[PDB]
Amino acid sequence: AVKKYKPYTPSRRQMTTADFSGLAKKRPEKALTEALPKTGGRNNRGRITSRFIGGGHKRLYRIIDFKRRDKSGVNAKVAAIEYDPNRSARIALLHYADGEKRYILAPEGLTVGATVNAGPEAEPKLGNALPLRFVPVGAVVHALELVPGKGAQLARSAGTSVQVQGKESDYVIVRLPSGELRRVHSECYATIGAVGNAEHKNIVLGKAGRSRWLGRKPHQRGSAMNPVDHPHGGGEGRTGAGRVPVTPWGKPTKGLKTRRKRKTSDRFLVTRRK
Amino acid sequence: MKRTYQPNNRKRAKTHGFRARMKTKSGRNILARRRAKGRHQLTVSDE
Amino acid sequence: SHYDILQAPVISEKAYSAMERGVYSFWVSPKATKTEIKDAIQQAFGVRVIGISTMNVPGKRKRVGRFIGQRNDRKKAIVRLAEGQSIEALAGQ
RNA sequence: AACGAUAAAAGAAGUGAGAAUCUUCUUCGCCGUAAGGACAAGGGUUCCUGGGGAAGGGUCGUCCGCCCAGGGAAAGUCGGGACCUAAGGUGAGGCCGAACGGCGCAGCCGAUGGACAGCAGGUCAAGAUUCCUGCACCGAUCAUGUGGAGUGAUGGAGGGACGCAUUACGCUAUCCAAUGCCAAGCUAUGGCUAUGCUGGUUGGUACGCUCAAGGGCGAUCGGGUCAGAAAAUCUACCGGUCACAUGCCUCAGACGUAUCGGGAGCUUCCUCGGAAGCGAAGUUGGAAACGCGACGGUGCCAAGAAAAGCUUCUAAACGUUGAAACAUGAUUGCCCGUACCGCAAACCGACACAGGUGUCCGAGUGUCAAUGCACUAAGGCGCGCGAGAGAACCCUCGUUAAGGAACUUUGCAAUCUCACCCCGUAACUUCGGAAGAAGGGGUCCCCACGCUUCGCGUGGGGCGCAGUGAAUAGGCCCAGGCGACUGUUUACCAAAAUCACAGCACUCUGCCAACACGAACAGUGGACGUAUAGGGUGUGACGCCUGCCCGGUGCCGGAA
RNA sequence: GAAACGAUGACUGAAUCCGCGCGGACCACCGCGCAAGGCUAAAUACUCCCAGUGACCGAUAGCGCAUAGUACCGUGAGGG
Ligand SMILES: [Mg+2]
Ligand SMILES: [Mg+2]
Ligand SMILES: [Mg+2]
Ligand SMILES: [Mg+2]
Ligand SMILES: [Mg+2]
Ligand SMILES: [Mg+2]
Ligand SMILES: [Mg+2]
Ligand SMILES: [Mg+2]
Ligand SMILES: [Mg+2]
Ligand SMILES: [Mg+2]
Ligand SMILES: [Mg+2]
Ligand SMILES: [Mg+2]
Ligand SMILES: [Mg+2]
Ligand SMILES: [Mg+2]
Ligand SMILES: [Mg+2]
Ligand SMILES: [Mg+2]
Ligand SMILES: [Mg+2]
Ligand SMILES: [Mg+2]
Ligand SMILES: [Mg+2]
Ligand SMILES: [Mg+2]
Ligand SMILES: [Mg+2]
Ligand SMILES: [Mg+2]
Ligand SMILES: [Mg+2]
Ligand SMILES: [Mg+2]
Ligand SMILES: [Mg+2]
Ligand SMILES: [Mg+2]
Ligand SMILES: [Mg+2]
Ligand SMILES: [Mg+2]
Ligand SMILES: [Mg+2]
Ligand SMILES: [Mg+2]
Ligand SMILES: [Mg+2]
Ligand SMILES: [Mg+2]
Ligand SMILES: [Mg+2]
Ligand SMILES: [Mg+2]
Ligand SMILES: [Mg+2]
Ligand SMILES: [Mg+2]
Ligand SMILES: [Mg+2]
Ligand SMILES: [Mg+2]
Ligand SMILES: [Mg+2]
Ligand SMILES: [Mg+2]
Ligand SMILES: [Mg+2]
Ligand SMILES: [Mg+2]
Ligand SMILES: [Mg+2]
Ligand SMILES: [Mg+2]
Ligand SMILES: [Mg+2]
Ligand SMILES: [Mg+2]
Ligand SMILES: [Mg+2]
Ligand SMILES: [Mg+2]
Ligand SMILES: [Mg+2]
Question: Keyword set for this entry (chain B)?
Fold first, then answer.
């Protein structure tokens, strides 16, 4: 489920580790293994836009086509469930009966070797490419596009499930994992099931290092900084605030709606993530 | 302890040189505004 | 042309004994090539050249009064012929 | 005052106008995981020869890294380019922008990396996988042949192609032993007269049914069009079929034989000492790599660059009486870098400066081992002021009667302690720990006996004050405050109670996401991430927990 | 400011002769005028350079320099 550790070192107690005992051990396919360099958070101007990014371990991209519509109407069989360091989830290896291999995202349960399909003409099985309209009411799914062909941008993190509330017009209502209700153009695609990994959410990190190894340079209380540096700075003691909680940029954190008030999305969200 | 100036030929040239100084406007400007002061030392290319 | 290039001969204990060996040594023209030098001496000395080497040398920066100056930098070249084909004009030195 | 580290100097000899300082000699002292050697970066003639002595040298100088003049550096195989790509820098058209300009796909530049044909010896005063000797290898163009029908890209696939830690067998370097082999002479000062003492003891290439641990390894027929734009002897899926142990394959390395070297020295000439000729042996035993066999085995989560060369298919295309492939001979071999200093007097520190500078090699003895400590070898030095004195005082160090923290702001400082083995070891605990707790005892030399060795237990003897005998080498404990912890911090007066942290918590955010850089509808980070994600804020392991006040401020919502 | 006029950024974009524009809000009168198309020597400004002069300097003066942007400092711009 998760490996644990006897307390032989101080930090080797709470520490916890994944269960990769179901990972088809394999060096990911060569003609699918692009090269990701890291970006300190600096952009093409060399200034840290994102903030607090740094190093960790060398990583590579595995192309994971999300629009299965490039090969729907035929099926492939699962070949392996290797380990991507860039995703919160696990990924799986597709052997299309007609030669071409691909990589797709791996869902919850889907045992190594199950032969899965793609096309509107597909059984609600785990791992099928299926349009959202042909999906049963109340069914469990992930990997949802905001338009046909675009690419699956919904339900991708570990153990996530967008849930078909049901059809309507040509826009199917949907339950986002955040707790939101979204209209989706029924010619949008889907992949049946929960994401899996699932266990992820729970692995205790355990020590500084473990943060570093995923490349998350140490985070910083502005309450450390000085006036010159950032808002909450100054003081003579472990000091409070003296103003309302606020980002470095002074635009309040803690209870301040930040979404842009006018938008085109505003007539596709029937409810709010509350 | 250890000092400010640790020479690096490639650095020196790729930093202060002539292809470099001409690559930018303000370096053209540095150039001719040097020339006027009768520099023999035009540029670290001329070392 | 087929002469201009060979800016001089080389003069020293070394050069002399190499000559004695059948290996001849000249200053040449910095910009030149080894193919160019081969063509050169092969032309103006009617010899079979089978061996060659070159080496660019700086120039002893020297002062004559408050005038620190560099000398012109040369390109020493060595050639080895075949079958004891000694060159005449230098064979007396 | 100081002459730049307390590594240390003496006597003889020589030279000169002049010598503590320069040159020979014989000793002494210091370094020896360096204070030796080889590179890189940097410097630039500082290298070698002959000369000079104004100034540079912390004194002196006849000397020098200073002055003068002259010489010295050699590559098809090393290194870079004529090949490749990373970050990054670029970049016609393209996207933007008061101007200058900012972006930006392909392409191109970019080594710190990929790729790649040569090794052994010899020598100038001064070069060396370059030159010279010996025997190789690679590409290129032509020719005589085997030719006798296919060659195989600007696109296809394969391959190149990679993490940390631990580790099995084989082996090399390379080092030790010896009444192995070779060579050399000698008898010391009481003895030894060799079974003593000193030194040397295989490098390359070629073959050879010789020995060899290790390591990689399948194959062929057919289907599916829909996979690689298409093609397709290829590559990928599906299916069938093939003596599991394996053989197929490779040969680090060793043994033999041969040949080329090298080899202690020996000889001969002779001019502050070299020039030249010659040349013996080649053993058993043991140790052993971070190197090679190698892209081996196993475990682990943090999940480990790209591109060309390369290998395979086909497209056009010209050929299919000269298509590839091959053997041999000819022939060809571009460009810069190679001196020297390079842990330092030659680079960066204004200096011939107790600093700084990245990788490699770095022998022996003793030591549980070791790049550790003492002493050494090869090698490199005695650090460019000297001599005497032997007061105060100052610096670094030894010893210390009685006492033993009386010192003092405080045991600050300094001593204690010190390694390996064996006995033994507390409250407390998160059951890991505390813990090397504490506290003891042993340690050297000889003979016999056993045992798995160099080695070690046992028994008896021996000596000294003492036997990790010299050097490297923890003082310990009780009890609090703060933080949990490993970490971080004020370059040059503060290293902690700071900060970070794993953990938890509030909110924000549904993708052209918030948020952030931005002439700006550009483009970028966020992220090739998707609410088990991302931002911001606060607390700061863990454990039991986290109450009362919504009036003011902020925030969320509401609508007359 | 009573703000005319020109001038443009964004919205609007009339008359062409019994017509158009101005006369410092605005109105009549009465005057000066031809927007939406272009070129134009001359006088004027400067002085790297050449020459002539001087109740300008003569070696701390005079340019920074009897010459040198060199020696020297600075990673650089630059100082000198
Ligand atoms: Mg935090
Ligand atoms: Mg502060
Ligand atoms: Mg402060
Ligand atoms: Mg402020
Ligand atoms: Mg404050
Ligand atoms: Mg050359
Ligand atoms: Mg000189
Ligand atoms: Mg004195
Ligand atoms: Mg001294
Ligand atoms: Mg002394
Ligand atoms: Mg003598
Ligand atoms: Mg005399
Ligand atoms: Mg001395
Ligand atoms: Mg050294
Ligand atoms: Mg010398
Ligand atoms: Mg002197
Ligand atoms: Mg003399
Ligand atoms: Mg650019
Ligand atoms: Mg390189
Ligand atoms: Mg090579
Ligand atoms: Mg090369
Ligand atoms: Mg050769
Ligand atoms: Mg081994
Ligand atoms: Mg013996
Ligand atoms: Mg005797
Ligand atoms: Mg012996
Ligand atoms: Mg390319
Ligand atoms: Mg050089
Ligand atoms: Mg000195
Ligand atoms: Mg020094
Ligand atoms: Mg060693
Ligand atoms: Mg040693
Ligand atoms: Mg030592
Ligand atoms: Mg030395
Ligand atoms: Mg006296
Ligand atoms: Mg005492
Ligand atoms: Mg006593
Ligand atoms: Mg103390
Ligand atoms: Mg216990
Ligand atoms: Mg103890
Ligand atoms: Mg006794
Ligand atoms: Mg005893
Ligand atoms: Mg100690
Ligand atoms: Mg702490
Ligand atoms: Mg400080
Ligand atoms: Mg301090
Ligand atoms: Mg107006
Ligand atoms: Mg005067
Ligand atoms: Mg003057």
Answer: Ribonucleoprotein, Ribosomal protein, RNA-binding, rRNA-binding
